[model samples]
Target: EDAMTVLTPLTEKDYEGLKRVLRSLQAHKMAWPFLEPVDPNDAPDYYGVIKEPMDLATMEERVQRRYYEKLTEFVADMTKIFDNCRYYNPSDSPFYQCAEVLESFFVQKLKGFKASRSH
Candidate 1:
């Protein structure tokens, strides 16, 4: 077996694929801000504006336990991570930039995931 053998889409379920990409994202340096929940003490106004907050930690926990029945549910939560950040932070803030970059990387990974499934 080769390293590529570990990435065979035909043998993996959507859950496994999601976890694989999430692990890659977790290892990314740009993932720092989105790793955990936002601290209320650090940003008192965060919860006030963002009624539903989402983060990588929460997503990981949900997927690990199969909280999402469908892959779309997982995608929704992942999209929320970026949306929540951009909503709360200024457009030019580093946090926003991180989300932008991470989101692009995420989209790229998702494309690969979807494309592989198409075959």
Candidate 2:
């Protein structure tokens, strides 16, 4: 059987692709709010409002550990960061807008990544 493009289960080669996407996301100015984990002391009510607090740092760590089994798993976590931000922040808040912008950027980047690999 020919070793054609079997894009599933996120092989080792896909690690580079994931890292590239993560780097792009981390480099974005909109990524500032999500760069680090939310502090409980900073916002005592934060944990209460956001059950599963995720951040770019955590996602990077997961990538370092090769935690993602599928590309969609990484996408889900990435999406979660935006979802959590929107859920906690009001529409008028800068953080909310950041999520909106970053999420759109991510969707586009993800599509590009898939397209590049499909060929």
Candidate 3:
């Protein structure tokens, strides 16, 4: 898959919100073990799909490993919504918001491979 392209700058709000979501997912073993941000390029392949899951006890080395690329990919998802709405409704009473993007990303991302959708 190619690198995800983004339309809007991910603000601090988005970053913080992302953390909270990750924190929640981690509690459920549904998120990467790390939160400090790590290079996805170097991340373990299993980290993407969790074919073989890792427990929090093993998460000591994994804690805080997630980072920018995740959010960047999400921005691409967010852009699609904008593009769709614009193509269907250039001018509208309602519009896509970051919150909607966050919700969508969480649902779809959790439902399957987030990378698959980003690609």
Best by TM-score: 2
> Candidate 3 clashing pairs?
34-63, 34-64, 34-65, 35-64, 35-65, 36-64, 37-66
Predicted candidate 1 versus true structure: per-residue lDDT over 53-116, tens digit per residue: 9999999999888787655677789999999899888998999999999999998998887776
RMSD of each: 6.2, 3.5, 15.6
| TM-scores for every candidate against the unseen true structure | 0.85, 0.90, 0.29
For model 3, how does the per-residue alpha-carbon lDDT over 16-57 read when each residue is reduced to its tens digit? 555554455445432332223333476555246433332323
Better of 1 and 2 by TM-score: 2
> Which portions of model 1 show Cα errors greater than 4 Å?
1-12
Worst 10 residues of 1 by lDDT: 1-10
Model 1, residue pairs in steric clash? none
User: Cα miss at 101, model 3 (Å)?
Assistant: 20
TM-score of 2: 0.90
Candidate 1 vs candidate 3: the lDDT winner is 1
What are the lDDT figures for the candidates, one per model? Answer: 0.83, 0.85, 0.40
Over the full model, what C-alpha lDDT does candidate 1 score relative to the true structure?
0.83
Model 1 superposed RMSD (Cα): 6.2
Selected candidate, larger TM-score, 2 vs 3? 2
Position 117, candidate 2: lDDT? 65
